[PDB]
Amino acid sequence: TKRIGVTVYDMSSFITEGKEGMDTYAKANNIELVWNSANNDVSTQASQVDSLINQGVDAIIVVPVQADSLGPQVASAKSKGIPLLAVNAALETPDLAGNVQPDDVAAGAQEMQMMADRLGGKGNIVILQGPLGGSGEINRGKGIDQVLAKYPDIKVLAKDTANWKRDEAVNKMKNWISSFGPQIDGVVAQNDDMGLGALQALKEAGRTGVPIVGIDGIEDGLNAVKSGDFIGTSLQNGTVELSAGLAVADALVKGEDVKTDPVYVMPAITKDNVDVAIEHVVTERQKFLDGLVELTQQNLKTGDIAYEGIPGQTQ
Ligand SMILES: OC[C@@H](O)[C@H](O)[C@@H](O)CO
Ligand SMILES: [Cl-]
Ligand SMILES: [Cl-]
Ligand SMILES: [Cl-]
Ligand SMILES: [Cl-]
Ligand SMILES: [Cl-]
Ligand SMILES: [Cl-]
Ligand SMILES: [Cl-]
Ligand SMILES: [Cl-]
Ligand SMILES: [Cl-]
Ligand SMILES: [Cl-]
Ligand SMILES: [Cl-]
Ligand SMILES: [Cl-]
Ligand SMILES: [Cl-]
Ligand SMILES: [Cl-]
Ligand SMILES: [Cl-]
Ligand SMILES: [Cl-]
Ligand SMILES: [Zn+2]
Ligand SMILES: [Zn+2]
Numbered sequence: 001t002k003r004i005g006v007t008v009y010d011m012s013s014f015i016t017e018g019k020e021g022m023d024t025y026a027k028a029n030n031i032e033l034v035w036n037s038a039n040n041d042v043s044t045q046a047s048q049v050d051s052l053i054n055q056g057v058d059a060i061i062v063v064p065v066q067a068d069s070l071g072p073q074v075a076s077a078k079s080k081g082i083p084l085l086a087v088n089a090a091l092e093t094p095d096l097a098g099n100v101q102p103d104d105v106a107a108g109a110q111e112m113q114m115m116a117d118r119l120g121g122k123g124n125i126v127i128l129q130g131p132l133g134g135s136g137e138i139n140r141g142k143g144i145d146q147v148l149a150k151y152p153d154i155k156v157l158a159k160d161t162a163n164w165k166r167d168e169a170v171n172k173m174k175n176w177i178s179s180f181g182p183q184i185d186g187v188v189a190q191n192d193d194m195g196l197g198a199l200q201a202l203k204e205a206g207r208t209g210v211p212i213v214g215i216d217g218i219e220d221g222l223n224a225v226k227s228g229d230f231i232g233t234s235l236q237n238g239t240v241e242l243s244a245g246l247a248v249a250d251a252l253v254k255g256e257d258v259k260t261d262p263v264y265v266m267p268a269i270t271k272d273n274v275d276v277a278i279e280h281v282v283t284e285r286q287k288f289l290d291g292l293v294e295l296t297q298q299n300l301k302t303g304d305i306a307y308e309g310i311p312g313q314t315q
């Protein structure tokens with residue numbers, strides 16, 4: 001019955017894994033999802049919002065390219081009574097109908113504290129950032145900086161974007177390896193994708209056992225934690241977070257009272273608990289999807305939208 005449009009920045013590993021979850025929720029709830037991807041381009045995303053408005057969809061979910069963007073389109077959707085939600089990354093506009101977000105400051109602090117722990121509070125690092133001007137970089141960078149403020153003996157040799165992408169991270173890391181070589185004691189990657197690119201560059205430079213930390217717990221990232229290629233990651237299960245987003249949108253379409261601003265808090269993943277994340281994200285995905293609508297509805301009541309039974313979460 002209901003048609004809900006989705007426009008995402010790009011089909012990143014996080015979004016790709018999460019789409020299966022969103023689609024599972026949609027099928028169970030008589031929602032037709034209209035997928036669009038913006039190729040990392042603000043103007044393309046603006047065009048996709050506008051087309052969804054024109055089509056007269058029941059609701060619109062945006063996973064934005066840039067935080068300071070889409071004002072006219074958000075205004076337009078609100079003026080026409082079409083609920084528009086930001087999910088996964090943030091917008092600056094005051095006109096959202098909902099706003100379903102990770103605590104990216106906390107995630108950035110958590111990854112940086114994993115590295116400080118690994119390094120014993122001393123060493124030189126490099127930092128790979130998400131797309132500049134996206135809330136992911138802005139907020140993960142705040143959290144990283146909060147932790148760096150406590151470690152005078154940790155030095156950042158370089159920071160730059162690799163736009164969430166593995167192969168851009170390979171190239172950036174190759175430049176830094178050329179510039180700074182075995183001065184690099186660790187890599188702090190704002191997502192798993194970029195940390196995996198950094199791993200590849202290090203491997204090619206003959207360099208083994210350099211600590212790397214990531215964010216997301218995508219399939220390859222979890223495998224890296226399990227093998228010791230990564231020191232850890234922070235779980236951002238897209239199947240859970242994106243279906244939470246859709247469930248808030250569905251509730252708005254239905255005129256239901258709902259928490260419109262829930263927060264996804266990413267649990268720490270290490271060798272201690274990685275096995276359970278691997279079951280849910282990698283090896284028993286279909287089983288996890290079969291439980292997702294029920295999980296989503298339960299979590300919507302507590303507000304704890306990240307809960308999925310990972311060791312360390314609230315029991
Ligand atoms: O900022 C929005 C992005 O989707 C991030 O949440 C992911 O961690 C990137 O892999
Ligand atoms: Cl993937
Ligand atoms: Cl699917
Ligand atoms: Cl598949
Ligand atoms: Cl599908
Ligand atoms: Cl922390
Ligand atoms: Cl803590
Ligand atoms: Cl710890
Ligand atoms: Cl050092
Ligand atoms: Cl050292
Ligand atoms: Cl920094
Ligand atoms: Cl690749
Ligand atoms: Cl390649
Ligand atoms: Cl690669
Ligand atoms: Cl993956
Ligand atoms: Cl903790
Ligand atoms: Cl599948
Ligand atoms: Zn699949
Ligand atoms: Zn699908």
Ligand SMILES: [Zn+2]
Nearest residue numbers: 103104105106
């Ligand atoms: Zn916070």
Ligand SMILES: [Zn+2]
Nearest residue numbers: 109110113268
């Ligand atoms: Zn902690």
Ligand SMILES: [Zn+2]
Nearest residue numbers: 113114117118
């Ligand atoms: Zn610690």
Ligand SMILES: [Zn+2]
Nearest residue numbers: 123124183185
């Ligand atoms: Zn050193």
Ligand SMILES: [Zn+2]
Nearest residue numbers: 141144145148
């Ligand atoms: Zn900084």
Ligand SMILES: [Zn+2]
Nearest residue numbers: 166167170200
């Ligand atoms: Zn590659």
Ligand SMILES: [Zn+2]
Nearest residue numbers: 170200201204
């Ligand atoms: Zn190569």
Ligand SMILES: [Zn+2]
Nearest residue numbers: 013017218219
């Ligand atoms: Zn994946």
Ligand SMILES: [Zn+2]
Nearest residue numbers: 304307313314
């Ligand atoms: Zn919780």
